[PDB]
């Protein structure tokens, strides 16, 4: 990994760490729409994303730069904000995890 992608990988590790588990856990795995009874999910969300997918892509060297990584993390949050009413718990959890993400992403080395 490039220096910037090392920083990205560090962030990803943090987002998956026990430190943030109380609000990160809905983002660990793909939304299983059928299992959760969300029969409209894939009509509304055209491009699902979650942290396990981001992790697989990082491990497989799919991301060519930090921007591509960040786009997937933000897609995951955007999907949450798109699908869910803003007063649902999962949205509050997304906002908190995105705060973690954005503040550390901003510390990207040049
Ligand atoms: C609607 C709402 O506020 N919540 C609270 C948090 C959990 C959500 C349901 N859910 C999701 C989930 C659902 C939606 C709609 C979503 O956008 N994300 C990101 C995760 N992933 C889950 C994995 C497992 Br195991 C058990 C329950 C899970 C219900």
From Swiss-Prot:
Effect of residue 38 to A: Reduced binding to histone H4 acetylated at 'Lys-12' (H4K12ac)
Residue intervals of the Bromo domain: 1-108
Impact noted for substituting residue 84 to A: Abolished binding to histone H4 acetylated at 'Lys-12' (H4K12ac)
Subcellular location: Nucleus; Chromosome
Result when mutating residue 36 to A: Reduced binding to histone H4 acetylated at 'Lys-12' (H4K12ac)
Protein origin, superkingdom: Eukaryota
Free-text note regarding domains: The first bromo domain specifically recognizes histone H4 acetylated at 'Lys-12' (H4K12ac). It also specifically binds histone H4 acetyl-methylated at 'Lys-5' and 'Lys-12' (H4K5acme and H4K12acme, respectively). The second bromo domain recognizes and binds histone H4 acetylated at 'Lys-5' and 'Lys-12' (H4K5ac and H4K12ac, respectively).
Misc note: Some specific inhibitors of BRD2 that prevent binding to acetylated histone are promising therapeutic molecules for the treatment of cancers or inflammatory diseases. ABBV-744, a small molecule, has been tested on tumors with success: ABBV-744 antiproliferative activity is mainly restricted to cell lines of acute myeloid leukaemia and prostate cancer and is able to displace BRD4 from chromatin. GSK046 (iBET-BD2), which specifically inhibits the second bromo domain, is a promising therapeutic small molecule for the treatment of inflammatory and autoimmune diseases.
Function: Chromatin reader protein that specifically recognizes and binds histone H4 acetylated at 'Lys-5' and 'Lys-12' (H4K5ac and H4K12ac, respectively), thereby controlling gene expression and remodeling chromatin structures. Recruits transcription factors and coactivators to target gene sites, and activates RNA polymerase II machinery for transcriptional elongation.
SUBUNIT field: Homodimer. Interacts with E2F1. Interacts with (acetylated) STAT3; promoting STAT3 recruitment to chromatin. Interacts with CTCF; promoting BRD2 recruitment to chromatin. (Microbial infection) Interacts with herpes virus 8 protein LANA1.
Family note: Belongs to the BET family.
Protein name in the entry: Bromodomain-containing protein 2
Residues of the full protein shown: 346 to 455 of 801
